[PDB]
Ligand binder design. Sequence first.
Ligand SMILES: *[C@@H]1O[C@H](CO)[C@@H](O[C@@H]2O[C@H](CO)[C@@H](O)[C@H](O)[C@H]2NC(C)=O)[C@H](O)[C@H]1NC(C)=O
Ligand SMILES: *[C@@H]1O[C@H](CO)[C@@H](O[C@@H]2O[C@H](CO)[C@@H](O)[C@H](O)[C@H]2NC(C)=O)[C@H](O)[C@H]1NC(C)=O
Ligand SMILES: *[C@@H]1O[C@H](CO)[C@@H](O[C@@H]2O[C@H](CO)[C@@H](O)[C@H](O)[C@H]2NC(C)=O)[C@H](O)[C@H]1NC(C)=O
Ligand SMILES: *[C@@H]1O[C@H](CO)[C@@H](O[C@@H]2O[C@H](CO)[C@@H](O)[C@H](O)[C@H]2NC(C)=O)[C@H](O)[C@H]1NC(C)=O
Ligand code: TRP
Ligand code: TRP
Ligand code: NAG
Ligand code: NAG
Ligand code: NAG
Ligand code: NAG
Ligand code: NAG
Ligand code: NAG
Ligand code: CA
Ligand code: CA
Ligand code: CA
Ligand code: CA
Ligand code: CA
Ligand code: CA
Ligand code: CL
Ligand code: CL
Lengths: 791, 792
Amino acid sequence: YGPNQRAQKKGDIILGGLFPIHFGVAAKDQDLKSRPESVECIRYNFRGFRWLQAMIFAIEEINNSPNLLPNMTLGYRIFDTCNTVSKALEATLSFVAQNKHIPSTIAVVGATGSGVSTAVANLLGLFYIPQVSYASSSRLLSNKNQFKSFLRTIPNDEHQATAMADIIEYFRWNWVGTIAADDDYGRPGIEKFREEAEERDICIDFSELISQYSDEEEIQQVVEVIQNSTARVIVVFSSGPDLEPLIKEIVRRNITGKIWLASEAWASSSLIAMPEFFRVIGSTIGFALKAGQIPGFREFLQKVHPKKSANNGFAKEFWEETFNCYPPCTGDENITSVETPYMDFTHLRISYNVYLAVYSIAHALQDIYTCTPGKGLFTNGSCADIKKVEAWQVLKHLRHLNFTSNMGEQVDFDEFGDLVGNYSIINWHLSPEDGSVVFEEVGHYNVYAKKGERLFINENKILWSGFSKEVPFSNCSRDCLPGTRKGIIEGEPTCCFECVDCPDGEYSDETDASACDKCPEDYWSNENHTSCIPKQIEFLSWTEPFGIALTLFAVLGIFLTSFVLGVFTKFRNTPIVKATNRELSYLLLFSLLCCFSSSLFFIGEPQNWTCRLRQPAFGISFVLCISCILVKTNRVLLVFEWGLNLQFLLVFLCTFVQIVICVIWLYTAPPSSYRNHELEDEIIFITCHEGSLMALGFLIGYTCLLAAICFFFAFKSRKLPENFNEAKFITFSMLIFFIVWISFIPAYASTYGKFVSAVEVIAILAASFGLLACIFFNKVYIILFKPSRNT
Amino acid sequence: PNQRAQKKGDIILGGLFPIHFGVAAKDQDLKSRPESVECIRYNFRGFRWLQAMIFAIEEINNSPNLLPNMTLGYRIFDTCNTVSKALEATLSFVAQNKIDSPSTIAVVGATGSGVSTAVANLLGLFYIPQVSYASSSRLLSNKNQFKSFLRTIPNDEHQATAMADIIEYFRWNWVGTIAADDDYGRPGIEKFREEAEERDICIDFSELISQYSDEEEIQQVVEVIQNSTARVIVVFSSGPDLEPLIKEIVRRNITGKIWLASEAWASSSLIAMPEFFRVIGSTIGFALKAGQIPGFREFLQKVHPKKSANNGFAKEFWEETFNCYLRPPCTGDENITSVETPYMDFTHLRISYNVYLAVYSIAHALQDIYTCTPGKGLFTNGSCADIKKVEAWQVLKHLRHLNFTSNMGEQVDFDEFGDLVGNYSIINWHLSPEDGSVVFEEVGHYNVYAKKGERLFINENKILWSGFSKEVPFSNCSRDCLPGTRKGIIEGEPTCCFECVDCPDGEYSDETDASACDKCPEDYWSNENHTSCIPKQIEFLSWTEPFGIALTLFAVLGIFLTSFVLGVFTKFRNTPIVKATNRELSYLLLFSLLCCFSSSLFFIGEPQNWTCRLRQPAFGISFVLCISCILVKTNRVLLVFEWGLNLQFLLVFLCTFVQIVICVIWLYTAPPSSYRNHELEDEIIFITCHEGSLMALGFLIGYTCLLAAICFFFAFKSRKLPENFNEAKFITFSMLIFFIVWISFIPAYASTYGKFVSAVEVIAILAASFGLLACIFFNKVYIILFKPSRNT
Ligand SMILES: *[C@@H]1O[C@H](CO)[C@@H](O[C@@H]2O[C@H](CO)[C@@H](O)[C@H](O)[C@H]2NC(C)=O)[C@H](O)[C@H]1NC(C)=O
Ligand SMILES: *[C@@H]1O[C@H](CO)[C@@H](O[C@@H]2O[C@H](CO)[C@@H](O)[C@H](O)[C@H]2NC(C)=O)[C@H](O)[C@H]1NC(C)=O
Ligand SMILES: *[C@@H]1O[C@H](CO)[C@@H](O[C@@H]2O[C@H](CO)[C@@H](O)[C@H](O)[C@H]2NC(C)=O)[C@H](O)[C@H]1NC(C)=O
Ligand SMILES: *[C@@H]1O[C@H](CO)[C@@H](O[C@@H]2O[C@H](CO)[C@@H](O)[C@H](O)[C@H]2NC(C)=O)[C@H](O)[C@H]1NC(C)=O
Ligand SMILES: N[C@@H](Cc1c[nH]c2ccccc12)C(=O)O
Ligand SMILES: N[C@@H](Cc1c[nH]c2ccccc12)C(=O)O
Ligand SMILES: *[C@@H]1O[C@H](CO)[C@@H](O)[C@H](O)[C@H]1NC(C)=O
Ligand SMILES: *[C@@H]1O[C@H](CO)[C@@H](O)[C@H](O)[C@H]1NC(C)=O
Ligand SMILES: *[C@@H]1O[C@H](CO)[C@@H](O)[C@H](O)[C@H]1NC(C)=O
Ligand SMILES: *[C@@H]1O[C@H](CO)[C@@H](O)[C@H](O)[C@H]1NC(C)=O
Ligand SMILES: *[C@@H]1O[C@H](CO)[C@@H](O)[C@H](O)[C@H]1NC(C)=O
Ligand SMILES: *[C@@H]1O[C@H](CO)[C@@H](O)[C@H](O)[C@H]1NC(C)=O
Ligand SMILES: [Ca+2]
Ligand SMILES: [Ca+2]
Ligand SMILES: [Ca+2]
Ligand SMILES: [Ca+2]
Ligand SMILES: [Ca+2]
Ligand SMILES: [Ca+2]
Ligand SMILES: [Cl-]
Ligand SMILES: [Cl-]
């Protein structure tokens, strides 16, 4: 006969009912020293009584409506579960009694716990009795090979975990921790969320299991792992009662920084949503089912009364727990005078599910009632009769039930027995009028939209941590700027890293970089390694200061030469001292002009033409000068052996000699005008690699040797006062040549790009300038000075 | 139910065994009234288990001491591995208590964690002891919900720990998981995921299966298995819930993986088929420890459908064995020893022993109830119960405090969670050479009593991989990191597969699998392979360096030529033919020469502050002494304008002191610090001297240069006086050779790094001093050595 505290009402058809009027049982572990007696449940749940009242109201409204099942009455045998499996199981045993004078229940509306409903459906489905639950939302109840006769008016919990992952990815967090009740409601949900979050590149720090029967040390361990972690977001998948201990311990230890992502079961629970817990838990964003509309329901709630309720039996205990009677009292108080979750509501969510379940079973019964004997759902097109209806026929009609909810909706269960709905997203607020927690809706989750466009959050209503209004930071490692790259911290997950600076020559312009990048050759990483600047080129220029200085030297020397030439064009035909070979003087002139014009060849950017001509031009001009001054000595050789031409011979001999090696280059190895970077790694250089090193050595040795023999045979006659004793002048000029050449070679041999050209150019310009001076100064001075040359 | 094994007695036990493997797959669309479902495939192992229970019961009934005059009856049913059959059997068990709101006292068995949960939810309602023998889920240890559930099989958390330990023992880190979607696979796989993740082991994929998943789910699972690179696959499932996946695997011929079997299917007969074995090679599984039930086999060899009225399962057993009918009509004369079945083709009793132990434990609980004495009982006030009217909760209370010895001499004692622990044997699938059946050879042990870390013990010499090879296959996400490289993140992949990037020059990485390169200190530099750092190369001038030897030999030869000049003077000092000049001035000039020549040695070795800070003023004072003494070696014009030759020394003992002032200035303003420098080379260290006062170096050199220049100008104006071999041109050429020395010196020094700075200084000073000595002395020393004619 089941328990004695129950709600009961007769009728042709009887429906079952399991509601959590209490919260749990008295935890007295029977040591079995005596016969174990029937355990007792302890706490009270006004929400559960609201649900039971909703079911009773639905049945009464069905019995009152004249169209749905006329000339037939609905009865019920509603029991209490106290949220435990033992009570539900004894109740269901009282249900299926007559199967194998007692009424035979045809349908069961209840089992609000996914652990409770599992154990109930295991037993009901053995007799094929339809069980229409309203609040059990575990996914395991979708295995229609196990629970053959289980339907539910509440959506499955897959979309809830998907929505959790979507919310976490929307606020751009990647470091969370998960808590789930060690039950059939938290385990599968947390597993689904784990996979959905790992596929979205989200890292999970910790994962713990709790329950209302967990001892104190395990709660200590959980609080420790919560405190010892850096994750700010905590995804809780549990119900009110199985969460209350953890909340009490967290309030006692005063952990304040975290953010709670509430599941639907406890996001609106009065056990948790109280101010002293709110000050500590801070910000909670949770889900909620869609509201309902049961017109005329409040006026039914306001009529509950302990003496005017013979059918309902829990009304007495309700009166007691709400007024503390039997301190005996009157029984004529007002339910509106005290504030309890009973009528302190604005949106009916689970009560609407109970209403819908009762109405769906009534509609299946009507469907069986309005049959046509030819188009039935059973074998041979036959159909069943409502006077001897059995449970399996009602199950058959429920599988194919498809009707219209008074809100103008379409109600029809899937092939997995469940319905589907679109969630509201609420965020906990503190009412400035009362102090109580009030749930304000801030977002929506439409599950019909395509994957990726389902969530809609209105961010300006979310109140973060009570005061501030920017999204808190809950990443593992700080995201560091461009110029840096991620760096593995071994042991830690893929979301936690250090970041190391990029070396020079590599850059990174992106945030969250995986590796730095080498830029092309003529580019180089800048000072912040964020963008490569074209690598600086360097060479001798014209706007450059030293460029202008040597240009000044060259042009002034050429101007001196042009002055000498003009003067000689004025006074050519006077052999006063020009009795010597005037042609030899003019040839010295043009040779020195070519020398001074060889300057320009080392001023700009060296292309191949430039230096490929800058070696031979200097070569020929310099050997012309030195050979002219060589043969410009005494005619000893002439005495030993047409016109001046014979002397020309010697020069037009010796020049050609050098010229030979010259052409060698142009047909063995031109001086390559190329670049070089290895020497600086920051600034590029451009020079000319000499085509043949030993051949350049040969060239300079040839010209210098000739000048040396000139010095020898010049100072052997170094004491003859002819033409103002030019012997000392030629020796002085050649000593100038040798000093500049010697001061040139070593410093040159160890110079980098620009200064090789610089040194060579200054050496040549100085040598030729000194020659010009030391040879023409005395003569032009005595002509401009004392016009008397006869001896 | 109708078919059952029933025997009467004073005390009744219950049993639940999977005689069949499942029910006939047929979906009732409920067009007609549903009827009793039927079971399809036979299971000889379950029948051996049932026979073990019956054998234990009858043997206890035959013992004189254990339950001396009592009698044990039993009512054994079949679960068909489904929940509905078990639940209707249970409803048949609790009929006596159900009528409150043939009473059994205890039930032995569920065989399935789902069946166990569904049964214990109902049995714990009446406090009836349920002693399972194979239910190994961890959810049944929650004694707040399953009050009266005891099991004689170890829990399955140790199994997940053992699997993680095996994986990290064979050095794998890229694996994948498969689980049955029931109360046995899900908790085990979650526990293994935790245990692996804490050991830094990656899990590539994670799937769920069941015997009811249709072709598309299995195809998606096979796609996930194939499109991955993990070789090791852990499977937490039973035989039936795994058979479809195995069929699909053997059809698609996936033939590369390594299977880590859980206990349920490691020794299963549905999976251990020779045809499946070709593609499921290299199977490594767990097993319970063997038992000894003496006299069991002979009891098995007596089954017969006629002489078994208590047992009812014998008829269908014979029909399934001989494939007969009681199509060809059957006859009770066959030989159960002829056909080969999982019935009698066994070698170790592992789950039959658990049934034996469960029955014996219930018997010993009843015994403890029986040999109790008043005042020493366990119930209220020390009171004790009567065995002739024993109730279920009393046997439960006695079972919680049960402690006895097995037939093998072990201590059976249920933990406070109602489960006794045991070791694991580790088997590996082999192929029998004779017939061809799969043979399970024991290759390892797992002791749960040893401390964490030294529990597993594998014998590598017996494991054979893939049938032919004998080296452990490679199943890592990425190949290892060789020395010289470092790990590099791939943005999307997990932590355990990376890339290999090279360490830059200046950093090294000797360790394998290094997360970052290390920079060697100031003294060292990377190798070529960036493996270890080798010391740098400091570049300072040696004394054994070739150029060092050339220049020091130059110095010593010049110095001994100076000493030879001094010896020549010692021979012919008092012959003033030319020494009538200032002899003391000659000696002082010669001393200035020797000390100038010797100043070279102070720029040869490594610079301390002593050596360099004194090497500067040595050259300074020596060279200015030289230039001042030759300055005074000129004609006495100043002397004519203005007592004793000492007067000239005034000038020199003036001039030197002047510059020595500057000397002391640097000596205590910012002396030339002898320090290192690498910034300009990045490979080689230059140790040089930075002179803290550039203006003081300028002071010294410019002062000496201006002295020389003024003396040169004044000697130049008088460069044409042929008295005393016309030394005027000699001294002007002297100052000019010194000046070209200095002229070539300054740009070279200006345009060099460390080494050639000192090289240039030494070269220039040696050159100038050599030239001065030669030009000033060679003339007169030649006039004496060559021309013995000295009169004017
Ligand atoms: C925490 O880490 C995540 C990445 O794991 C960051 O999310 C990125 O945010 C930027 C800016 O919107 C996007 O361009 C990226 O596409 C996001 N990454 C991914 C995978 O979507 C997040 O910004 C980090 N949190 C903070 C405060 O920076
Ligand atoms: C799913 O959530 C969405 C959000 O409103 C609801 O879909 C809307 O319903 C109304 C009426 O059909 C339309 O005006 C809107 O255009 C719909 N939005 C979209 C994107 O289609 C819907 O009501 C929710 N699901 C249920 C069963 O109510
Ligand atoms: C599990 O672990 C080992 C088996 O390897 C058993 O301990 C050994 O038992 C024998 C005899 O009992 C001793 O001689 C050894 O010294 C033991 N070895 C160690 C390391 O202790 C142990 O008995 C097994 N546990 C059970 C319940 O059988
Ligand atoms: C696969 O990855 C694991 C992870 O390191 C490697 O395990 C290492 O193996 C060497 C050899 O014994 C050990 O010295 C290391 O200590 C191990 N690493 C860790 C963190 O324990 C394994 O070597 C890799 N597989 C192969 C074939 O290289
Ligand atoms: N889905 C929840 C049931 C539930 C929904 N809302 C609730 C509110 C309070 C308690 C329980 C619930 C479960 O599986 O347990
Ligand atoms: N332990 C498994 C059942 C099991 C163990 N060993 C077995 C051998 C054969 C069949 C089933 C089993 C479970 O929890 O369900
Ligand atoms: C709890 O922690 C917060 C952190 O600031 C602090 O403000 C508050 O005073 C603490 N309250 C108690 C009771 O410890
Ligand atoms: C309760 O008492 C009466 C009867 O219901 C009602 O009119 C009254 O408004 C209620 N009291 C309050 C404070 O609302
Ligand atoms: C049944 O479903 C269809 C569409 O699915 C809809 O048109 C109809 O209104 C529903 N109800 C009935 C009674 O057909
Ligand atoms: C199956 O896989 C194995 C290994 O690749 C190969 O030898 C064999 O040919 C394949 N096909 C069949 C039918 O076995
Ligand atoms: C047949 O039964 C008996 C056993 O007593 C014996 O002849 C023999 O063992 C059996 N046959 C075979 C092949 O074992
Ligand atoms: C259990 O039995 C053994 C053998 O009598 C004994 O050693 C032990 O003390 C007993 N009690 C416990 C708690 O093990
Ligand atoms: Ca309930
Ligand atoms: Ca609640
Ligand atoms: Ca780790
Ligand atoms: Ca079973
Ligand atoms: Ca099996
Ligand atoms: Ca990924
Ligand atoms: Cl509600
Ligand atoms: Cl076995």
